[PDB]
Symmetry: C7
Subunit: 73 residues, 7 copies
Amino acid sequence: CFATLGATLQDSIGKQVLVKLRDSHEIRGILRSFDQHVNLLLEDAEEIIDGNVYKRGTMVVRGENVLFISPVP
Amino acid sequence: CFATLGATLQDSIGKQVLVKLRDSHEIRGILRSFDQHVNLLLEDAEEIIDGNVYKRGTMVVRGENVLFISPVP
Amino acid sequence: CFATLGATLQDSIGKQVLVKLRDSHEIRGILRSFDQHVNLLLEDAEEIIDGNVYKRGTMVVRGENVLFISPVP
Amino acid sequence: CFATLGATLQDSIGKQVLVKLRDSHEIRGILRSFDQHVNLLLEDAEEIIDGNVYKRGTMVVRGENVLFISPVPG
Amino acid sequence: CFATLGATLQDSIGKQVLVKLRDSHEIRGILRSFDQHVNLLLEDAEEIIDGNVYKRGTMVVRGENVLFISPVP
Amino acid sequence: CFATLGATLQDSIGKQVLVKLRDSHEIRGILRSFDQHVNLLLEDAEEIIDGNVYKRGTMVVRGENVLFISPVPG
Amino acid sequence: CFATLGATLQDSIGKQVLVKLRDSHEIRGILRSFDQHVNLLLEDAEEIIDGNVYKRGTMVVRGENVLFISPVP
Ligand SMILES: O=c1ccn([C@@H]2O[C@H](CO)[C@@H](O)[C@H]2O)c(=O)[nH]1
Ligand SMILES: O=c1ccn([C@@H]2O[C@H](CO)[C@@H](O)[C@H]2O)c(=O)[nH]1
Ligand SMILES: O=c1ccn([C@@H]2O[C@H](CO)[C@@H](O)[C@H]2O)c(=O)[nH]1
Ligand SMILES: O=c1ccn([C@@H]2O[C@H](CO)[C@@H](O)[C@H]2O)c(=O)[nH]1
Ligand SMILES: O=c1ccn([C@@H]2O[C@H](CO)[C@@H](O)[C@H]2O)c(=O)[nH]1
Ligand SMILES: O=c1ccn([C@@H]2O[C@H](CO)[C@@H](O)[C@H]2O)c(=O)[nH]1
Ligand SMILES: O=c1ccn([C@@H]2O[C@H](CO)[C@@H](O)[C@H]2O)c(=O)[nH]1
């Protein structure tokens, strides 16, 4: 009787997640924190660009451009 | 005497749906939860990219970037 | 002495309509329901992509990306 | 002492207008109705795509994605 | 002790201006009216597209897509 | 104990600034005025298009499409 | 029991940060200030365009077009 998206992100704290953003951006990282707007705090994050992988470390991601968030299987 | 879009989504719970997003993204998965902004929780989700299928598993999709959702026939 | 766009959509219930969206999407389907934000419920819908036609069936379309809706003559 | 954009649209009722939208869309038709958000109802509308004309008839256009509306001189 | 953007546009009434919009649109015309949202009423307007010049005459432009407005020297 | 972005802009009045906008636009001009929404008034402005400079003069820029503002060094 | 994104940014004051924006813009600089909307004040900022570095100095970045902010490791 309530949406479970929030419960899902809470369950993802500490897990690696795949995040895709507007303008064809693809990021992977450990989800450490997030808010109701889907703004995210990732650690050990990395960008995947045309097969290249660039480690970034800590990353704050604005929710407005997030397409989806998926815990890596 | 009321729009039936929400009713359609409720009826799609547990069914596979095709979801297209901004920037030509195409995703398929089992609809498990959603809210009034069309934010979605999908299970057994996959992206269709250039004819290939990438399995992702659990996926939270932001409604703001959703173009359409269609239960797979 | 009032805009007649809503009356036009009401009159299009049950008719086939052409809908184009942001990012060059073109869809055709039977309009079954809609709301004041132009969110739409289509049945027997199909996507037209580069000459290809993909049948989808039931489709919920977010009005925010809708460019136009035109009852098929 | 007030903007006249609204009066211009009122004056275009019944006239053909050229309308361009986001993502390079170009449409023409007779303006039959409009609101303050620039949502439009066109009759005898047609899309101009790569120099070719596609007749659509009645068309509801969302103002959110309109760039400009220009009554056709004629 | 106040922003002077509004004053500038007021001073441009009756002048020819260059207006550039989202998606690479470039327009020239005489500014006849405007509002606080930068919506514009132009007369004797023309579009400049890849070297082509198409005369349009009267044009109502939505401020939301305006990039800049520059009265022509 | 407060953001200093507005103070930076205030300090930029009279200086030439580089402004880049959505859709790859690059502009330069003297910052003369601005508001809390980052709408800008530029004088002696110019666009840089494909390496070439096009002088425009006075220009009103909408903050919504602004990516960044940077006073030109030296 | 609260999101830690804001605290991450506070901790990054005086640090080198990598910032990516809409339309494929990539910027590097020292974070000097910021607000709740992710508008940023950067110093010794530079743009990375096609693999080359363009030094810009002081830069105010609008949060609305920011994709992510990542403190350089
Ligand atoms: O698209 C999304 C993804 C996640 N959530 C989270 O799920 C809860 C829904 O009420 C919120 O706390 C929020 O953090 C949303 O609301 N929307
Ligand atoms: O595009 C859509 C899909 C669904 N709904 C339904 O309408 C309510 C909108 O807030 C929600 O509860 C949802 O079920 C919409 O309005 N728009
Ligand atoms: O694009 C549209 C279509 C319809 N409506 C309104 O929604 C109602 C639908 O019956 C009408 O009264 C009409 O004013 C809009 O505001 N915008
Ligand atoms: O871009 C435009 C075009 C027209 N109007 C007119 O101004 C009024 C604003 O509420 C409406 O009645 C409408 O006709 C605008 O405000 N903005
Ligand atoms: O950057 C801008 C552009 C326009 N305006 C509004 O547009 C009108 C321009 O003369 C003014 O009344 C003002 O309210 C602004 O506030 N900021
Ligand atoms: O991007 C910006 C620029 C300025 N300001 C604030 O808005 C006021 C404009 O005069 C200033 O005091 C400043 O703190 C912002 O919030 N964001
Ligand atoms: O993405 C972000 C980054 C920071 N903040 C908050 O906005 C304030 C800016 O000073 C901080 O206290 C911080 O908690 C957010 O809400 N979202």
